[PDB]
Ligand binder design. Structure first.
Ligand SMILES: [Zn+2]
Ligand SMILES: [Zn+2]
Lengths: 173, 173
């Protein structure tokens, strides 16, 4: 357990009110957030999206990735379902950080691909720790998860990270 | 000088390409970003917007503030001008942090106003350090600034922080 649940408040959006729950990394004070729509109590598996933060795509209208597009799509789909969770996993640039992400982007501007750029900068293709997501689900009292994603490989990755995924729900985009 | 300029890369948006410049706080490694549109060289004052980060408004579609609305409006206006800068000042919740911002929001959900909530949590109404913005402008070779804002008080605040503002340009919203 790398996190603690510290506060919650209302987050009104165009799709309705989500309960915003803030989590804190015990060792660093770094934050993560979960947006909970409706009543997620009960034994029924809970619909959920794991969204890793991308400042450029999520906030700065970047056209070089689909993160912002996916964020809106997931929130919309969860609200439509009427019950669900979106985890905002704050590990920018597959966990290499924003500044290194800009360095990687500069190399990509020169013809390098994301894997090549990261390698030249001294990082693996993906350095994210998804067990932080398992922590958030556990702290929210969630067991079985219906994971929103169009990539079966992501189901494998998250299951390995300790998330009990019982179904893959295509992300409507 | 609290910052150093460390990397830059292209940020394509619906309004055209911005040059994204990443800055690093020398003492913490924390990042800030500047989005530069067009050619800002020359003696002419440069149009600029200082936008303090708001995760909820900028990325999570929050309806409880206008930050996301203002972010889009400023980027649009700068691109229309053809030359300009948007500083993305990363001091969430007037510099009290996201987790404390959620705590403040919880008190606001109970009837407290932002100033009362912050005070109860042990913070002033606004703890931001805008000299970080002056640092970014200096590192970008910018002297005179035409500040995008509808609040004359903000011009006073930023001028006190060391930014040479020669004109206030209403933010078209
Ligand atoms: Zn992205
Ligand atoms: Zn805001």
């Amino acid at each position: 357990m790398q996190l603690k649940r510290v506060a919650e408040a209302k987050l009104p959006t165009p799709w309705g009110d989500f309960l915003m729950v803030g989590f804190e990394e015990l060792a660093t004070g770094h934050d993560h957030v979960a947006l909970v729509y409706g009543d997620i109590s009960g034994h029924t598996p809970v619909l959920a999206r794991v969204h890793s933060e991308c400042l450029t795509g999520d906030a700065l209208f970047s056209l070089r990735c689909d993160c912002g597009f996916q964020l809106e799509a997931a929130l919309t789909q969860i609200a439509e379902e009427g019950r669900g969770i979106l985890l905002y996993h704050r590990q920018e640039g597959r966990n290499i950080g924003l500044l290194n992400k800009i360095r990687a982007y500069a190399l990509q501007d020169q013809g390098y691909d994301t894997v090549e750029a990261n390698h030249q900068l001294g990082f693996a293709a993906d350095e994210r720790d998804f067990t932080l997501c398992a922590d958030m689900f556990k702290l929210l009292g969630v067991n079985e998860v219906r994971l929103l994603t169009n990539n079966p490989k992501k189901v494998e990755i998250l299951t390995e990270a300790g998330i009990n995924i019982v179904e893959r729900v295509p992300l409507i985009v």
